[PDB]
């Protein structure tokens, strides 16, 4: 095996003999941009470039939660 | 095995005798911008380009979640 | 086996012998720009490009969820 | 094997023995924007263009869910 | 096998003895702007274009769901 | 196998003794502008073109849904 590239992800549940249980696992997913290449040979000229990547984000969330048994 | 690109992903869920359970497991998956290239000979030339991403995200959602047993 | 791209996603359940069971999996699937590219031999020659990317998202989603056993 | 790219993706749900079960699992696919390029030969000559991708997003979906066993 | 793109994408769904079962799985799909592309010898030629793709979105939907057991 | 483009999608049950059961399947499909090419060669010489995508979606579909077993 040469070169290669092996991502693993996900969710993995067993359950063999639930009797009386509740099992509670949402997957939230999301991937945002995601960029994947492959070449044999790649050659790449450029010049006097301008690459802006700007994340503004006003993640407003108070939590107030509880959890009781 | 030369060159290439696995990517894993999902649930992977599994009942074998369940007498009396409730599984509840929401699956959502939001995939934004995906650019995969695959290529023998790449070349590319570029000039004084511009490239601009630009990420404005007033996320807003308070929690008051409360989990009982 | 050479260059190749291979991406797994989704969702595998498996229910056995569910004598008395409630499986609660909805799958939603959201998938954007996807682009994927493949060749032989690919030369792109730019000039002054002006590539732009604009995201404005006001998530607006508070939570006041519960779970109860 | 040479160059070649494979997306999976989807469902996988199997039920051997339901005696009383009920399995509620809702699928919803939506995919946008999809671009997929296969050449032998891609020879792209540009001048100076102007990409533009805008995407307003006013998500309003506060939640009030709650589950119970 | 040389250069080739497979998309898999669906539901598979396998039920062998249900006694007593309710299976719902609704398969809900909409696919929007898909663009194939296949060439052997592909040269494009371009000027000053502008490629504009606009996104207003304002999605409501409020949620209060609620599962029960 | 040279080139080529294989899309899999759709729906796939397989019900083998029903003795007593109730499967609801419903399948929605919703594809608009798809845009498939095929060429030898192809030769393409543009202009000061101009391409515009308009998308406004007011998506309007508040939701309180409840599942009871």
Same mark, same amino acid.
Request: hydrophobic residues 40%; proline residues 4%; aromatic residues 18%.
């Given at each position: 095996?040469?070169? #290669?590239?092996?991502?693993?992800?996900?969710?993995?549940?067993? #359950?063999?003999?639930?009797?009386?249980?509740?099992?509670?696992?949402?997957?939230?997913?999301?991937?945002?941009?995601?960029?994947?290449? #492959?070449?044999?040979?790649?050659?790449?000229?450029?010049?006097?470039?301008?690459?802006?990547?700007?994340? #503004?984000?006003?993640?407003?969330?108070?939590?107030?939660?509880?959890?009781?048994?």
């Amino acid at each position: 095996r040469l070169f #290669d590239q092996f991502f693993g992800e996900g969710l993995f549940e067993y #359950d063999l003999l639930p009797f009386l249980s509740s099992t509670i696992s949402p997957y939230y997913r999301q991937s945002l941009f995601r960029t994947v290449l #492959d070449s044999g040979i790649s050659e790449v000229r450029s010049d006097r470039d301008k690459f802006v990547i700007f994340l #503004d984000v006003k993640h407003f969330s108070p939590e107030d939660l509880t959890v009781k048994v």
